[PDB]
Design a protein around this ligand. Structure first.
Ligand SMILES: Nc1nc(=O)c2ncn([C@H]3C[C@H](O)[C@@H](CO[P@@](=O)(S)OP(=O)(O)OP(=O)(O)O)O3)c2[nH]1
Ligand SMILES: Nc1nc(=O)c2ncn([C@H]3C[C@H](O)[C@@H](CO[P@@](=O)(S)OP(=O)(O)OP(=O)(O)O)O3)c2[nH]1
Ligand SMILES: Nc1nc(=O)c2ncn([C@H]3C[C@H](O)[C@@H](CO[P@@](=O)(S)OP(=O)(O)OP(=O)(O)O)O3)c2[nH]1
Ligand SMILES: Nc1nc(=O)c2ncn([C@H]3C[C@H](O)[C@@H](CO[P@@](=O)(S)OP(=O)(O)OP(=O)(O)O)O3)c2[nH]1
Ligand SMILES: [Mg+2]
Ligand SMILES: [Mg+2]
Ligand SMILES: [Mg+2]
Ligand SMILES: [Mg+2]
Ligand SMILES: [Mn+2]
Ligand SMILES: [Mn+2]
Ligand SMILES: [Mn+2]
Ligand SMILES: [Mn+2]
Lengths: 481, 477, 470, 476
């Protein structure tokens, strides 16, 4: 009935409309309190204790800030309170679909557990959102505050996942197209979701950031672009936009793809796979699901959080011994050892299906060196990481519209050459990391020899420490030295 | 093989000796990852997602910083690497004994589940530390790095809990070492310094104490034939401010009325669940939530998870407990009625009779509903400077730049006339389990009447919530 | 004119209305770039390089934030764009009257140079504001944007200095709350404090996560004694006490830092010696002195921190005495701090008159001493400003209530003012300093002042004399 | 005794008494009156900071790094004497800066005294010598174990490089202590503590975000043998952070140090100084009088050349300075030369570019015709500090498995998303005529000149010069 104020360390005091409060105070939303934003990253950065819940509040907040700012600067847009609330709800609910340890679940576990299924947190979010609305009688409340549930639920889902299918959207018309650019921007990835996690992750990781998404909001405008009304940035902000993506890449390099964070994520995933058939999760009508099938039933999925990790760890079931033992090894910090990193060379890329064959490939290499131990495919992990600017090969800034101060209503396009010659020439790459399950000194030395030999055999890039870890092997390849 | 570096948002890059790493990488220590620093506070301050684990690293770090600084400034102290490691270990392990949602467990749940016992997180920490050492073969590792486990385990425990010269782990010449992690003399320790900075970072609030500066100006002097840590004289204002900051954090955050009520509701749920949750201990034995403190192997598995285990349960026996937790999720909380203070110095002894007392008041007003003792919660909160009635600064030793080895004492008048005249008080909060508008209105009338009957302070909103009752008391108006 | 955005490290991006930009882009306002916020404090805290200019932008910004927030939450107040602009202008211009090194000028120099005159930066700000308006043709611009200069200039001045019975003419009682925002004469809770807390902390290197933002969010207007006044939410009372605690702590640690004050004192002495020999050109080419530039705003416009360097870099023999003091500051050959106690021109003589029962190699004279009396209070002399705050409760947000100290905490101060008395010595010799300590502690004992913290160390012979001290 | 100074960036800095003696001198304290970012303060009101506080930070970080190396590698035989010398160089590296910093050495001196070859580095060495000699520091250095002959040489070399073909061109320390020259001012690859302080300090004051974590870098720094020298090596995994450091530097230049209006204010101040030059007199050694442009010849005069000069001119009663004073007054009214636009070359002294723009004949009607003198053309070199070169190719690294073995890492071994180029230019054009008709004309000349030269299409080209932009087919 009245607004609530929430104090957030990143954003300070956030005002929440009563309808938003109703949505937040539900089991489906509060679930996000028990899911770590950075998953295994917490085990490397102790500051990163934050969960999806607080991130979601921030995203809803910033979504409101942006839509409000646009409305105040351009009354002609006819932005309504109903529009503002719908955008905030989408911002709040965009991460509802995340599973235990966030990206590990959708990124690592589900692809291995259920390769046939094509699943993402986005799809999960839409399903959970529907479940949230229907389970908690939210629709009546939406009507009370002027929302029209048929159109607006559609609109909210479309903001989260894109067209459920010309204008392909049904929730709002072309004149309100800019509303779809705020929470999850499918056009170029510039959205408030990134702005919140940049600031929040940095706050917790202990990586400094004085920058303003606030600045961006202040300079945002709506212009006509190809018969749609779209969000346009001021021209001079283009450098800041390139930097936003640079920041994202740096955060991935330093933190999200930290070699040990990833290995912990990998180990947890392995534990989950071993546990899958023995954990049972109760769904709608008392039906039982597995970790990998809870995504099919939202009532079951509601109860799938980071807790599962502890349920396995603390279990006594003999059937869970293999899974439990992996988790125990994580606790003792008996983790697999990082051997090295390389990149695929020139046009060659690694296909997703071929990830599985890779450990065998490394083991198959014959390094021209004496070896005390012989290592097996099963002793290796090979982690293939796709680093990009959020749009695969594409430059997202080529998909941004800008305006100039002398003609604020006229959208223009800006190419990379018009900005700096020091920008990336490519917007995607792969990293290949190799680890060894055998942690002893002799094994690790051997693993380094196999690894560097495999790099040479494949014409991959010379590992940075190649000359130190494998002095005998590196001479072989002339390109390297 | 060698040191590890950990990046902390509060302290930046912390170097950890390999022995410390071995201790950290154990189930008993890593458990702290799953216990929230501020418990129910997270449900009011979404920034407060931090756990005991990160706080513990910070405390170990600052313990090392202080002992190192003292050694570098005063080589004569003969501080040893062995001493430094023992102080760090105590700093790291001082919070090992905490249970689910931290202070709620030792502060609220255990006193109700096991009223006969005096139990504290300190005692828990000593027991867990012993379990950690013995379960993970740490003693051999300690010897490898020059520690003497018999003496040093004793020393570490004594730093955490105090005497088991009453100390056996170190002699009087090394007395100052016992002032660093948990200072029983005046409460000025590195544990406070970390949580001030860490809680503030996460809460989104401002901290008055500058701990780095304090460390830089710390020295050891002879005081009554002990070597004790002394602060530079000009830092006295900063020390008063440290305690002010602590009090403000309690007022704004740790004792936030809704955080406390959520803690209370969780405690109630735990009590209802107690007999039906079973926690597996050493040798496969089963314990209860309230008895896991007896077996460290069981206690190791007692973390915030328990909350979710109850919440996600389907056992009919757990329905009552589960329903309370579900109400928390729907934000269907017990309602805050009001807050008052007992009058001047007079203070309230330990509590169960209080709800009945409020219900017994007969407010001279029209009431649609009549409320019962069981409908009320009364929460009594002791706010002080850490030493009951006493001023801890009267128990600090200082030095002047013109005579750095000469300890002096400084009284409150020598500092400021704007300081507190008192160092302890109580807050009394009343809540109602009946959440309907008519019940809440009635609860307000009982509450304000009870305040008037007892001569307690006028609630701030007394004139608004109970316009008919407030005229009765002349003092108030 | 158009709207401009300014990036501020404390507040981030501040939007400025074109009328505000016009006011800012004038010699009278830009002058504030050349006046340090903390004066001599920069010579102790190297981070405190900030000037009055950036502080002024922040105050104007926060004034706008508060008035806007009140208007959005309570449309019934009938707050107008004209009102918002006037409040912002007052916030921007409230520190226009500051002189070189800020408080030193109004706090130390003017009282000594011109004891007969009663002058404050507030009065200076009003005069400069008038000069700014009249010199730069701002009144026509104000009209263009809907302001009514006769009423609104009056209103702006009143916000800065107070009344020139509702005693205000610029706005009526219904808009009384507007006078509480920039410079709150009722209880001191204003946006000026909120900016300098955050800004000074940022530069000093003293941490502050807290929010004035929170305060703004919980501010409301209620009827109080037939005026509309700003009321805080009841639960914020603890935070308000803490605001004043913060202020006191900043004064103790930084603004009244014993060496910052002594540098301010030395600079003041140098200014006094230089006064007649520096000439500052005013309106009509007339010449003024440092101490008389306050009479002519055209002259005052050219009176900034630069004067310090003009003196320091001078070669005029007449300025040698002044120049030498400044040179001593550079060499860090400072007047020496002797000590501090707790209970103005006559004081140095009084200390010198004390006869300490100790052997002294040197005899010191009144002129060798500086006595600095510092009033540490909660901004309202003896009074508790929180007793002059109105609050509201969530169950009746339009109903103002009063909260007394006992309703809050028994751990709060019993007193809201004190004095610190610091004594320094000009001479700086070891023997002189030792003597100064003996005179000082003896004077403390003679007057029944508090025992200096280091009294037993600096004056072991004297301290036994006084029984209370022990 | 030691003194402690509280710094907002670094917290509490401990200063050895010898350092305090050096700091408490007119030559050092002068830095309090010189803005770090010059005209930048007139765009970013947060940037009030001066060279003085930056210098303390640099001296502090220099001490942190040399101390850390000594503690990790006792074999280096780092001495207290070495630590103090490194700190003194760090403290004194910016002594030579003039009013508004880079504006003085970058803009004013090149125009006032084109024949002279002058830099702030050279100034710093001269001022340092003046500081030492004027304040009797050498005796104090000896008292604390310094050897002035060798150590003064060492300090100067750290600041300006060899005073001189040789594997060792330095005289102040031998090859075994080579790593000491990499700390304050790194001529090999530019990775030094001077950048680390100004990144953090400028960001603090500007209200922007800094990518480089210098404390981490220090923690992972080591010394290894490289080509018969002992050099500072970074841990291999820090290479990404190093690339980011340079990215941060470039971003700071783009957003702040080369802000179009900050630069124009710097240009206007420089113009004012040029007009004032002959009329301001600055007293030097023996009471001799110098000009703003000649104070660099006498350190006693240079000591008194600070930002104050700006205010002296602005507040001058004296008529003689009316043209100079008027320019400064225009700055105060914000009556600035107008930015017309920015472009980039394909490719890459002073008088010629404005003339070129004016010479273009745009196929458009023009109310006014503009002259070379009405234009300013500002050419800005954006690079990674080493002209065309990649500085990371000049860094040595080590791996955890062999911490004493230095290796080299090439760009392809890091990321394919790194820059392909390490240098570019920006060309900005401004107009001294500020009226609407003049500005419109200036835009037409500018865009025409861009088209004529095949420079990049200005971002707002289609808006400011709709008629010209069609002509160029490339411009899509
Ligand atoms: N930064 C800060 N300082 C403080 O002193 C403080 N106090 C609370 N909060 C945070 C905690 C929350 O994140 C938020 C609201 O706290 P509130 O106490 S205003 O909320 P309700 O208890 O519901 O008061 P009601 O029911 O009477 O309206 O601000 C605070 N945040
Ligand atoms: N601020 C920051 N920036 C960074 O780039 C970064 N990288 C890590 N960390 C945090 C995460 C950790 O908390 C800490 C060290 O991470 P590290 O990657 S050096 O450690 P290991 O993987 O063990 O390196 P090795 O095995 O080769 O010695 O700093 C960082 N913290
Ligand atoms: N925080 C931050 N990041 C930045 O990239 C940046 N750039 C500038 N500023 C600060 C400096 C100012 O304090 C403010 C605006 O700078 P602007 O570049 S938007 O202004 P004009 O040059 O007038 O742009 P125009 O004339 O083209 O509309 O933000 C910035 N502040
Ligand atoms: N952050 C901070 N908090 C504070 O409370 C404080 N107080 C001072 N400083 C800063 C200001 C200075 O930059 C630094 C040292 O101030 P100091 O007061 S220790 O030094 P002297 O007065 O000379 O002490 P002595 O009485 O032994 O001579 O710390 C402070 N810095
Ligand atoms: Mg509430
Ligand atoms: Mg490691
Ligand atoms: Mg502009
Ligand atoms: Mg001192
Ligand atoms: Mn998200
Ligand atoms: Mn603790
Ligand atoms: Mn002010
Ligand atoms: Mn520098």
């Amino acid at each position: 009935d009245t607004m609530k104020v929430i104090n957030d360390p990143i954003h300070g005091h956030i005002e929440l409309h009563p309808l938003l409060v109703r949505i937040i105070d539900t089991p489906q939303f509060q679930r996000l309190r028990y899911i770590k934003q950075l998953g295994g990253g917490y085990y490397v950065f102790p500051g990163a204790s934050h969960n999806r819940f607080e991130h979601s509040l921030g995203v809803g907040y910033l979504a409101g800030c942006l839509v409000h700012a646009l409305g105040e600067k351009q009354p002609e847009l006819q932005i309504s309170e109903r529009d503002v609330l719908c955008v905030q709800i989408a911002g709040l609910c965009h991460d509802l679909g995340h599973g235990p340890f966030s990206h590990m679940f959708d990124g690592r576990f589900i692809p291995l557990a259920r390769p046939e299924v094509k699943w993402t947190h986005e799809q999960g979010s839409v399903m959970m959102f529907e479940h949230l609305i229907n389970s908690n009688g939210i629709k009546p409340v939406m009507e009370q505050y002027g929302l029209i549930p048929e159109e607006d639920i559609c609109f909210i889902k479309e903001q989260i996942v894109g067209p459920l299918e010309l204008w392909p959207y049904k929730g709002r018309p072309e004149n309100k197209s800019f509303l779809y650019e705020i929470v999850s921007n499918k056009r170029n990835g510039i959205d408030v979701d990134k702005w919140d996690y940049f600031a929040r992750d940095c706050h917790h990781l202990g990586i400094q950031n004085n920058f303003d998404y606030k600045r961006f909001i202040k300079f945002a405008r709506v212009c006509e672009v190809d018969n749609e009304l779209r969000i346009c940035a001021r021209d001079k902000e283009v450098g800041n936009l390139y930097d936003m993506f640079h920041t994202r890449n740096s955060l991935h390099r330093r933190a999200y793809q930290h070699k040990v964070g990833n290995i912990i994520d990998t180990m947890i995933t392995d534990a989950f796979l071993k546990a899958d058939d023995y954990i049972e999760i109760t769904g709608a009508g008392g039906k039982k699901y597995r970790i990998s099938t809870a995504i099919d039933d939202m009532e079951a999925y509601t109860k799938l959080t980071d807790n599962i990790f502890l349920e396995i760890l603390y279990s006594t079931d003999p059937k869970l011994k293999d899974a439990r033992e992996i988790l125990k090894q994580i606790e003792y910090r008996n983790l697999f050892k990082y051997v090295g990193e390389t990149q695929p060379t020139g046009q060659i890329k690694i296909k997703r299906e071929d990830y599985e064959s890779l450990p065998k490939e490394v083991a198959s290499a014959k390094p021209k060196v004496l070896l005390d131990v012989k290592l097996k495919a099963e002793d290796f992990i090979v982690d293939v990481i796709n680093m990009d600017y959020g749009m695969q090969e594409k430059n997202p800034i080529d998909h941004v519209s800008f305006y100039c101060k002398t003609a604020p209503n006229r959208a223009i396009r800006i190419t990379k050459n018009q900005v700096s010659q020091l920008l990336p020439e490519k917007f995607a790459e792969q990293l290949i990391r190799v680890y060894c399950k055998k942690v002893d000194r002799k094994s690790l030395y051997a693993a380094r020899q196999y690894f560097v030999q495999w790099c040479a055999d494949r014409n991959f890039t010379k590992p940075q420490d190649g000359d130190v870890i494998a002095p005998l092997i590196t001479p072989q390849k002339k390109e390297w030295n």
